[PDB]
Design an enzyme around this catalytic site. Structure first.
Site, PDB file in Angstrom:
ATOM      1  N   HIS A   1       0.806  -1.259   0.000  1.00 42.79           N
ATOM      2  CA  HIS A   1       0.000   0.000   0.000  1.00 42.79           C
ATOM      3  C   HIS A   1       0.833   1.299   0.000  1.00 42.79           C
ATOM      4  CE1 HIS A   1      -0.001  -0.500   4.559  1.00 42.79           C
ATOM      5  NE2 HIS A   1       0.222   0.814   4.460  1.00 42.79           N
TER       6      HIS A   1
ATOM      7  N   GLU B   1       0.891  -8.392   0.563  1.00 45.10           N
ATOM      8  CA  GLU B   1       1.106  -7.024   1.118  1.00 45.10           C
ATOM      9  C   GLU B   1       2.587  -6.710   1.317  1.00 45.10           C
ATOM     10  OE1 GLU B   1      -1.294  -5.038   0.803  1.00 45.10           O
ATOM     11  OE2 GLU B   1      -0.415  -3.250   1.766  1.00 45.10           O
TER      12      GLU B   1
ATOM     13  N   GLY C   1       1.207   5.530  11.072  1.00 43.29           N
ATOM     14  CA  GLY C   1       2.632   5.853  11.259  1.00 43.29           C
ATOM     15  C   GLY C   1       3.491   4.622  11.541  1.00 43.29           C
TER      16      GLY C   1
ATOM     17  N   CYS D   1       3.169   1.530   9.879  1.00 45.13           N
ATOM     18  CA  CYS D   1       3.260   0.622   8.707  1.00 45.13           C
ATOM     19  C   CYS D   1       4.713   0.569   8.238  1.00 45.13           C
ATOM     20  CB  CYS D   1       2.240   0.964   7.627  1.00 45.13           C
ATOM     21  SG  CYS D   1       0.559   0.504   8.159  1.00 45.13           S
TER      22      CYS D   1
END
Length: 181
Positions: free
Chosen positions: A41, A72, A146, A148
């Site tokens: 992402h 991911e 904040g 990730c």
């Protein structure tokens, strides 16, 4: 404070950079040579900022399992003038559950941040932001925006990168040795 935080700090101080994309600032784990990882992402493009230096992206691969399900994890090869310490021998070979993990973050917003998250479950399937995702680890800590890209470790193992939360639990994508052969 103890040997878990010791291993986490050793990884942060040599094997992380601050990555900035058009989607924000992320903790980015460097694994070996000029190869790093970041949550998919983050939407890595042709250029990324690495510790506020404009850096060409030589390759970026959004991993999926052989069911063609999102993992991911994006593997990024950076046009950087310096190699990372090789930490591939600290990566697990298989999916597993863990005890007593630390989530470690380093950004402009959250420098030198370490969180004891306790027990880590092999959760498996997660609908992450509407996207079916596999190989998810879960911990019962109320993680926030904040975090990730944050690195999940135990003593002697680098087991995942933080990719999301539901306000009460946090979720990481597994790192496996076989991603970096």
């Amino acid at each position: 404070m103890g040997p878990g935080f010791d291993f986490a700090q050793a990884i942060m101080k040599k094997n992380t950079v601050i990555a900035r994309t058009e989607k924000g600032e992320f903790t980015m784990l460097g694994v070996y040579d000029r190869v790093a990882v970041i949550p998919t992402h983050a939407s890595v493009g042709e250029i990324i900022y690495i510790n506020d230096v404009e850096t060409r992206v030589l390759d970026a691969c959004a991993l999926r399992d052989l069911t063609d399900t999102n993992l991911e994890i994006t593997i990024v090869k950076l046009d950087r003038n310096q190699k990372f310490r090789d930490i591939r021998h600290f990566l697990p070979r298989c999916e597993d559950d863990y005890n007593d993990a630390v989530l470690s973050v380093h950004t402009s917003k959250f420098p030198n941040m370490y969180i004891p998250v306790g027990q880590v479950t092999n959760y498996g399937f997660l609908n992450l932001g509407g996207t079916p995702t596999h190989r998810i680890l879960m911990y019962n800590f109320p993680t926030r925006a904040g975090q990730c890209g944050g690195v999940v470790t135990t003593t002697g193992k680098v087991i995942g990168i933080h990719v999301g939360g539901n306000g009460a639990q946090g979720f990481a994508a597994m790192l496996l040795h076989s991603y970096f052969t």
